[PDB]
Nucleic acid binder design. Sequence first.
DNA 1: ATTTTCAATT
Length: 199
Amino acid sequence: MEASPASGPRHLMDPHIFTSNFNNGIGRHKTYLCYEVERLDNGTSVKMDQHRGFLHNQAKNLNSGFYGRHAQLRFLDLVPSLQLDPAQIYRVTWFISWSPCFSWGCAGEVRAFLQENTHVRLRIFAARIYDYDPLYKEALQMLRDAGAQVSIMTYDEFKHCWDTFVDHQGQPFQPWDGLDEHSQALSGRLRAILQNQGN
DNA sequence: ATTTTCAATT
Ligand SMILES: [Zn+2]
């Protein structure tokens, strides 16, 4: 297991794990949540020294054997840690490999946060939409009520994501021929869920 | 455009 270099900083993401996790292929994949924090200044976006970070659904705990719930809930507690103030506007984007998520408290608590902080802008990016049965359709509409901000990832974003999430020299990102077929479906799948809004 | 996928330990 070569894994990422020990002398290297944990801020860099391994290329195999990043590609394998973003590959969305059939086999074994660990759910990962990536988020970014930026400070807006009079309409001017400003980035801090380094607030990039991500969370995984895999943790350790043999003595308690207890596992954390949805990674989205854990990030919710990360909001108060930053101590965001209502006098300023901050842009927070959450990236999740899967979009579907059945739960009566996950989206419920997340929706309550948006209602409590209407000045906070939250963007949700769905790398792939296929994890829960069609029921997730109603769950998506519930979150869309307060999170009316849904966007799909594009191949161009993948190139930048690798450089931003991965910074290796001599190992360029090698895109797989699968975004074109899903890229068009992602737009069709996203509008399909919103099409129910006409009802 | 589609691909009948692992996640709590030893
Ligand atoms: Zn959830």
